[PDB]
């Protein structure tokens, strides 16, 4: 599924991301925009044997198990295929873990490069929340 901006914002709000660990909703929407272009099926296969999965491009070395990645930790305790669903629940639950495991949103390269320091409220402006 390719989400709309406001539709994704509402889904992320329903799942408790607004102000999760001090990150406003627009940060999460911005991260998804630049990680995956709002596409739940996005995959990026890296040369290091790992793969980034889903709307938040969560990597298979630390966070989910795909059976193919060296050094797997599976800290979210999920198969990576769960991150390719049309429903965002598994991606949101794992994203919450990423931040709870002592990372901030700097764990997402697209957040740090394209969202940090910007007016991230723009990403939820005009939306029914
Ligand atoms: Na996309």
PDB file of N, CA, C and O and ligand atoms in Angstrom, residues 1-3 32-42 54-55, ligand 1:
ATOM      1  N   UNK A   1       0.890  -1.202   0.000  1.00  0.00           N
ATOM      2  CA  UNK A   1       0.000   0.000   0.000  1.00  0.00           C
ATOM      3  C   UNK A   1       0.906   1.224   0.000  1.00  0.00           C
ATOM      4  O   UNK A   1       1.906   1.208   0.717  1.00  0.00           O
ATOM      5  N   UNK A   2       0.486   2.236  -0.721  1.00  0.00           N
ATOM      6  CA  UNK A   2       1.143   3.532  -0.622  1.00  0.00           C
ATOM      7  C   UNK A   2       0.214   4.466   0.105  1.00  0.00           C
ATOM      8  O   UNK A   2      -0.908   4.729  -0.384  1.00  0.00           O
ATOM      9  N   UNK A   3       0.570   4.847   1.314  1.00  0.00           N
ATOM     10  CA  UNK A   3      -0.255   5.737   2.113  1.00  0.00           C
ATOM     11  C   UNK A   3      -0.243   7.167   1.586  1.00  0.00           C
ATOM     12  O   UNK A   3       0.712   7.634   1.024  1.00  0.00           O
ATOM     13  N   UNK A  32       8.938   8.448   7.486  1.00  0.00           N
ATOM     14  CA  UNK A  32       8.381   7.512   6.550  1.00  0.00           C
ATOM     15  C   UNK A  32       8.419   8.023   5.122  1.00  0.00           C
ATOM     16  O   UNK A  32       8.660   7.287   4.168  1.00  0.00           O
ATOM     17  N   UNK A  33       8.159   9.330   4.934  1.00  0.00           N
ATOM     18  CA  UNK A  33       8.189   9.909   3.591  1.00  0.00           C
ATOM     19  C   UNK A  33       9.558   9.675   2.956  1.00  0.00           C
ATOM     20  O   UNK A  33       9.636   9.248   1.789  1.00  0.00           O
ATOM     21  N   UNK A  34      10.613   9.993   3.657  1.00  0.00           N
ATOM     22  CA  UNK A  34      11.930   9.955   3.051  1.00  0.00           C
ATOM     23  C   UNK A  34      12.592   8.594   3.130  1.00  0.00           C
ATOM     24  O   UNK A  34      13.461   8.308   2.317  1.00  0.00           O
ATOM     25  N   UNK A  35      12.149   7.714   3.993  1.00  0.00           N
ATOM     26  CA  UNK A  35      12.637   6.330   4.009  1.00  0.00           C
ATOM     27  C   UNK A  35      12.043   5.504   2.880  1.00  0.00           C
ATOM     28  O   UNK A  35      12.747   4.765   2.216  1.00  0.00           O
ATOM     29  N   UNK A  36      10.714   5.598   2.698  1.00  0.00           N
ATOM     30  CA  UNK A  36      10.012   4.652   1.843  1.00  0.00           C
ATOM     31  C   UNK A  36       9.067   5.299   0.877  1.00  0.00           C
ATOM     32  O   UNK A  36       8.406   4.589   0.094  1.00  0.00           O
ATOM     33  N   UNK A  37       8.904   6.606   0.895  1.00  0.00           N
ATOM     34  CA  UNK A  37       7.879   7.275   0.119  1.00  0.00           C
ATOM     35  C   UNK A  37       6.484   6.714   0.426  1.00  0.00           C
ATOM     36  O   UNK A  37       5.632   6.637  -0.437  1.00  0.00           O
ATOM     37  N   UNK A  38       6.276   6.360   1.689  1.00  0.00           N
ATOM     38  CA  UNK A  38       5.000   5.897   2.218  1.00  0.00           C
ATOM     39  C   UNK A  38       4.577   4.549   1.685  1.00  0.00           C
ATOM     40  O   UNK A  38       3.405   4.168   1.806  1.00  0.00           O
ATOM     41  N   UNK A  39       5.520   3.766   1.179  1.00  0.00           N
ATOM     42  CA  UNK A  39       5.218   2.468   0.560  1.00  0.00           C
ATOM     43  C   UNK A  39       5.512   1.341   1.568  1.00  0.00           C
ATOM     44  O   UNK A  39       6.650   1.116   1.951  1.00  0.00           O
ATOM     45  N   UNK A  40       4.456   0.639   1.959  1.00  0.00           N
ATOM     46  CA  UNK A  40       4.597  -0.447   2.903  1.00  0.00           C
ATOM     47  C   UNK A  40       5.415  -1.629   2.420  1.00  0.00           C
ATOM     48  O   UNK A  40       5.873  -2.406   3.241  1.00  0.00           O
ATOM     49  N   UNK A  41       5.567  -1.748   1.106  1.00  0.00           N
ATOM     50  CA  UNK A  41       6.272  -2.869   0.491  1.00  0.00           C
ATOM     51  C   UNK A  41       7.713  -2.547   0.178  1.00  0.00           C
ATOM     52  O   UNK A  41       8.412  -3.401  -0.376  1.00  0.00           O
ATOM     53  N   UNK A  42       8.204  -1.363   0.526  1.00  0.00           N
ATOM     54  CA  UNK A  42       9.556  -0.985   0.141  1.00  0.00           C
ATOM     55  C   UNK A  42      10.563  -1.938   0.766  1.00  0.00           C
ATOM     56  O   UNK A  42      10.503  -2.260   1.938  1.00  0.00           O
ATOM     57  N   UNK A  54      10.097  -2.220   4.701  1.00  0.00           N
ATOM     58  CA  UNK A  54       8.843  -1.589   4.983  1.00  0.00           C
ATOM     59  C   UNK A  54       8.866  -0.090   5.040  1.00  0.00           C
ATOM     60  O   UNK A  54       9.827   0.592   4.648  1.00  0.00           O
ATOM     61  N   UNK A  55       7.765   0.452   5.554  1.00  0.00           N
ATOM     62  CA  UNK A  55       7.507   1.880   5.537  1.00  0.00           C
ATOM     63  C   UNK A  55       8.536   2.686   6.285  1.00  0.00           C
ATOM     64  O   UNK A  55       8.780   3.851   5.942  1.00  0.00           O
TER      65      UNK A  55
HETATM   66 NA1  LIG B   1       7.485   5.054  -0.924  1.00  0.00          NA
END
